[PDB]
Design a protein around this ligand. Structure first.
Ligand SMILES: CC(C)S[C@@H]1O[C@H](CO)[C@H](O)[C@H](O)[C@H]1O
Ligand SMILES: [Mg+2]
Ligand SMILES: [Mg+2]
Ligand code: NA
Ligand code: NA
Ligand code: NA
Lengths: 1015, 210
């Protein structure tokens, strides 16, 4: 009958014989174990070695598999995704569905995972009460059998399905058989931009509950206006036989202290003409001066819910952590405990490079710590309810959570084709209702979300009202269909820009500043997604935080996103590499679009992470004279674990430093008076650097963790001294093909046919492998490429503008190349015109002045045609012969930084191994730039001026011809790119031009100068 | 000490090139010991009689952003017309030039002065690629004003009627000029993007008789 029905092609059937959803249960039989949250003997894990077979369709499954283990089957670990064991390929597709859009039908070729487990059940479990099995995550649908007999069916990949097995089990050995379908009608609601995988990918467990049981419970906390008094209100529901002697005690614990308690018989107040719930009771406990919960200080109490007899004999106990906090939207602001929030948030998919979409404690804890260490206070569960441990950890470490229903229909045309259809309302309701029923007691959850990218349909409106109806404690948000519809309490656009309107028809993304004040609008604005961190990105991130700070109603947003969705593959030798869309044979695919992380799949930071930590700082700084003004952006806590380290350096040389403890109240100010700074009698720029240090370890950080920093230029003393003139004067050696300049061991050569420095010699040895030439291009970034492909060009992307204008294949044409012997130097003048198909793109006018001290002063003046697309950069490159261990520079650093992403970088003297000057982006592009650099040192070379540079063993050309990082080979010598000017990287999104006007190279005429010498 | 800064010569050299003469100079503007500005210049006079001037200026990060970075001189000649390829015809400044159009303009000299009742810097025109006055042509990318009045007389004089034409013609050619503001007139109002804050500035001119 199971093959006959095809429930996996019926959106009307989303479960069979499935128990109601409810908050996390453990069925403790001792109230103390409940209080302390110790393991419970009534909740057994079924995780571990299971038997697995793969089949191309459910019709291909043999009927014997219900009765006997299959010999051809293997033994695999559960939980797991079966794509992660090599049974089939994972598919990466963004928008377009991984299957043909023919609702409600799926392909007849429907990969089918048959899982089985022979396991033991004790006698005690079967003489009394109720034995249920819980599947926390099954992708995407499944039928369940126990000892040959059919139990039930379930959908929704991301919420627990629970089945009563009491009537199916026997003492001793038992066998489960689980038929998991890759594709079902649920897939239509699971079109998240992520790897499409399947199987039993979350925990499986058995729970024993008494016959008379707690079947549900809800905890609410309400406050007076100043938060000095709370009422905890706990509503408890039982199943079983209703008897007079039945009682519930809800008791509230702070550590080992019981702060409050209440006990009542069942039978709530009269509700309507037929009475009340005889199977319910509401307990109300008064709490004076409650410790409030926030992400800053996650104060938790323990609620123990005891079901017992009048006389005091326990039946069972459940429990949860309670955070006393109010979430309300008042007067257009989202308030926590009466204070306006500034969401420093991130989107976080559940992703692991080895285990796929299986989650474990270690990884979750690792994620939380990195998040907090980098100044995040919020996470969006993009785009499904998470592993249940996640909320628990968020409660305990303190993050604000957006809990999001598992509904995404992005690939539909138009996006709301299902969500407007009343026939898909049942399947949608269950994905929202079952989330609320499960997660509503977690204080970390502050906002409910109706899903993502499903357009705006009437079903959203119904479910919005439903949530507001059952849970008035939390705002409901939803971005779809324009981000400000009647199904959202919060204007929550994705990738809406700061100042720039993008007025799309029907779904405009307004400038977020403009959006707030549209006629009639009053709601707060928090971006559900912003700052697409794909490859070398996060350009313009500071612009967001400047606006968030200035506008009370701009209350932050969630970065897209936390971690790259790269997956580990292995080569012939056996070494791992990071893989994206299309690397498992999967087609069609959206390639590197699965990697948008602030961190790599192994949780190593991208350079952008540091930019986020800095902009997301909690202490603001202003300098007047010798006074640092510190302002706190904390809402609740004092800076009771903070000192300020100040430091003054002259072009990187330390002159003074000190420490002052920070004692600033939430939203408050502290003035720090620096001691007399010693005026240096030496040319240079004085810089002030302050760093906020946490001297003590926390649950989330180590002692000496730096949480904030800032810099200022203090006094500058410009160099008025002429260098001591030299005896020697360089000699010019004119040839047919060459101008050679000699001075001591040093020699320069200008090729008269190309017009460039073709070679330099120090003593005997050659310094160049490639001549010094102008460069106007870069290995295109993900943002430069957007959605452009080889077989579907987007002529709007920066890369295509560059290609079509001939930037990548323009040829230097020599207009001029003269030599002149001066009094104490040799002067080489040049002029080039870069042309493509008769159009002059660029003109470079240079002079090289080689003086008697062996220094070469290079002066570059570039004309850029007003009607050519603005170039990626205006600089020079060459390939040096030298491979040295270290790079030393006076500029912004130490990490990679670009004109629109340099706020986190500090001006100082930095020294790193060459390998740190390369950023290993999985899709290779221009990388490792450092800006505002006054001096660069590499081997015997030193460059001086005011430039940006990158330095690496990889040419711009190899970076742009290579698709994966691991396929890069180190070239001979070191590619040096020195830019006078470099275009922003953008990232407001990654599918249109996103580089802001003020970071484009549009001036038409550009000037830079460099001195080159041996030291 | 911007209005009192004394020029102190650092360098002044001459060179003979194949087809030109190169004059390199360096100055430091100082005020009671502190160096506010350094001006590095080359002059290149070639066969066709053109004097190419390159100017590279350093501005101390801790001095208030200067009003302008340019050159000035009192010209002997007094012509009747001022002709230029640039923004105009009327006075325009960096933060007040949207109305001005790029074309070839020709006005009487008196039209290049603006009779503000309380005298001040005035009559600037921006984004000029070419300026013609009497025998003189200047080419590049600059801002300029031109009048019978000096910056010194303008700032020393409380009313326009008290002004007197000076001998010759005062010429101000700026590579860069600060905004004028006006959001109000009782607190600094010139926006950050129109303040001369880059620290290093470069402009180039070609001066020939046409
Ligand atoms: C128009 C498309 C690029 S939609 C875009 O794709 C992104 C790729 O990372 C993210 O998944 C966003 O959530 C989605 O809006
Ligand atoms: Mg179905
Ligand atoms: Mg999507
Ligand atoms: Na705000
Ligand atoms: Na993506
Ligand atoms: Na590439």
């Amino acid at each position: 009958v199971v093959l006959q029905r095809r429930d996996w092609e019926n959106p009307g059937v989303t479960q069979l014989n499935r128990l109601a959803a409810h908050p996390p249960f453990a069925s403790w039989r001792n109230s103390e174990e409940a209080r302390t949250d110790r393991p419970s003997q009534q909740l057994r894990s079924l995780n571990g070695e299971w038997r697995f077979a793969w089949f191309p369709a459910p019709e291909a499954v043999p009927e014997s598999w219900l009765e006997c283990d299959l010999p051809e089957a293997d033994t695999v670990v559960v939980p797991s995704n079966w794509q992660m064991h090599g049974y089939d390929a994972p598919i990466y597709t963004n928008v377009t569905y991984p299957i043909t859009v023919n609702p409600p039908f799926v392909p007849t070729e429907n990969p089918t995972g048959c899982y089985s487990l022979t396991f033991n059940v004790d006698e005690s479990w079967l003489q009394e009460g109720q034995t249920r099995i819980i599947f926390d995550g099954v992708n995407s649908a499944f039928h369940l059998w126990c000892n040959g007999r059919w139990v039930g069916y379930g959908q929704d990949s991301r919420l627990p399905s629970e089945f009563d097995l009491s009537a199916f089990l026997r003492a001793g050995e038992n066998r489960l058989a689980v038929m998991v379908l890759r594709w079902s009608d649920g897939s239509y609601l699971e079109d998240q931009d992520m790897w499409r995988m399947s199987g039993i990918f979350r925990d499986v467990s058995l729970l024993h509950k008494p016959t008379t049981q707690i079947s549900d419970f809800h905890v609410a906390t309400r406050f007076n206006d100043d938060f000095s008094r709370a009422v905890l209100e706990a509503e408890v529901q039982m199943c079983g036989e209703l008897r007079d002697y039945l009682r519930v005690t809800v008791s509230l614990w702070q550590g080992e202290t019981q702060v409050a308690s209440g006990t009542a018989p069942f039978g709530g107040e009269i509700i309507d003409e037929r009475g009340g719930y005889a199977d319910r009771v509401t307990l109300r406990l008064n709490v004076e001066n409650p410790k409030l919960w926030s992400a800053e200080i996650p104060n938790l109490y323990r609620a123990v819910v005891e079901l017992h007899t009048a006389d005091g004999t326990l039946i069972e106990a459940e429990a949860c952590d309670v955070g006393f906090r109010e979430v309300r939207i008042e007067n257009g602001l989202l308030l926590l405990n009466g204070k306006p929030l500034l969401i420093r948030g991130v989107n976080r998919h559940e992703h692991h490079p080895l285990h796929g979409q299986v989650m474990d404690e270690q990884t979750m804890v690792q994620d939380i710590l990195l998040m907090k260490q980098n100044n995040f206070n919020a996470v969006r569960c993009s785009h499904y309810p998470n592993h249940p441990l996640w909320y628990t950890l968020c409660d305990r470490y303190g993050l604000y959570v957006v809990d999001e229903a598992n509904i995404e229909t992005h690939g539909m045309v138009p996006m709301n084709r299902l969500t407007d259809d009343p026939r898909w309302l049942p399947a949608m309701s269950e994905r929202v209702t079952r989330m609320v029923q499960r997660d509503r007691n977690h204080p970390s959850v502050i906002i409910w979300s109706l899903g993502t990218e499903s357009g705006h349909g009437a079903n959203h409106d119904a479910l919005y009202r439903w949530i507001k109806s059952v849970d008035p404690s939390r705002p409901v948000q939803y971005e779809g269909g324009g981000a400000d519809t009647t199904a959202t309490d919060i204007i929550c656009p994705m990738y809406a820009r700061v100042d720039e309107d993008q007025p799309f028809p029907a779904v405009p993304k307004w400038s977020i500043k403009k959006w707030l004040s549209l006629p009639g609008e009053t709601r707060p604005l928090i971006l559900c997604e912003y700052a697409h961190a794909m490859g070398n990105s996060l350009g313009g991130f500071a612009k967001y935080w400047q606006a968030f700070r200035q506008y009370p109603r701009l209350q932050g947003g969630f970065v897209w996103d936390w971690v790259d969705q790269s997956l580990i593959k292995y080569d012939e030798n056996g070494n791992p590499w990071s893989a994206y869309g299309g690397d498992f044979g999967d087609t069609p695919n959206d390639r590197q679009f699965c990697m948008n992380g602030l961190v790599f799949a192994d949780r190593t930071p991208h350079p952008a992470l540091t930019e986020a930590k800095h902009q997301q700082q909690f202490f603001q700084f202003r300098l007047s004279g010798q006074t640092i003004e510190v302002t706190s952006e904390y809402l609740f806590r004092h800076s009771d674990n903070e000192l300020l380290h100040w430091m003054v350096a002259l072009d990187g040389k330390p002159l003074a430093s000190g420490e002052v403890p920070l004692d600033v109240a939430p939203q408050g100010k502290q003035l720090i008076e620096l001691p007399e700074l010693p005026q240096p009698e030496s040319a240079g720029q004085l810089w002030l650097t302050v760093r906020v240090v946490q001297p003590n370890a926390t649950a989330w950080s180590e002692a000496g963790h730096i949480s904030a920093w800032q810099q200022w230029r203090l006094a500058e003393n410009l160099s008025v001294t002429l260098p001591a003139a030299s005896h020697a004067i360089p000699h010019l050696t004119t040839s047919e093909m060459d101008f050679c300049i000699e001075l001591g061991n040093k020699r320069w050569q200008f090729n008269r046919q190309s017009g460039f420095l073709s070679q330099m010699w120090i003593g005997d040895k050659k310094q160049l492998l490639t001549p010094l030439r102008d460069q106007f291009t870069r290995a295109p970034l993900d943002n430069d490429i957007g959605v452009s492909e080889a077989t579907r060009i987007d002529p709007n992307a920066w890369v295509e503008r560059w290609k079509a204008a001939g930037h990548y294949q323009a040829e230097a044409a020599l207009l001029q190349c003269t030599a002149d012997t001066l009094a104490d130097a040799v002067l080489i003048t040049t002029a080039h015109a870069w042309q493509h198909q008769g159009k002059t793109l660029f003109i470079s006018r240079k002079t090289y002045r080689i003086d008697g001290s062996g220094q070469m002063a290079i002066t570059v003046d570039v004309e850029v045609a007003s009607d050519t697309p603005h170039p990626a950069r205006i600089g020079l490159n060459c390939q040096l012969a030298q491979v040295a261990e270290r790079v030393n520079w006076l500029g912004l650093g130490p990490q990679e930084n670009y004109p629109d992403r340099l706020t986190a970088a500090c001006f100082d003297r930095w020294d790193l191994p060459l390998s740190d000057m390369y950023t290993p982006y999985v899709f290779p592009s221009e990388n490792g730039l450092r800006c505002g650099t006054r001096e660069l040192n590499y081997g015997p070379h030193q460059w001086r001026g005011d430039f940006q540079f990158n330095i690496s063993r990889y040419s711009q050309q190899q970076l742009m011809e290579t698709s994966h990082r691991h396929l890069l080979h180190a070239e001979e010598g070191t590619w040096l790119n020195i830019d006078g000017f470099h275009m922003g990287i953008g990232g407001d999104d990654s599918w249109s031009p996103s580089v802001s006007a003020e970071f484009q190279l549009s001036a038409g005429r550009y000037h830079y100068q460099l001195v080159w010498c041996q030291k």
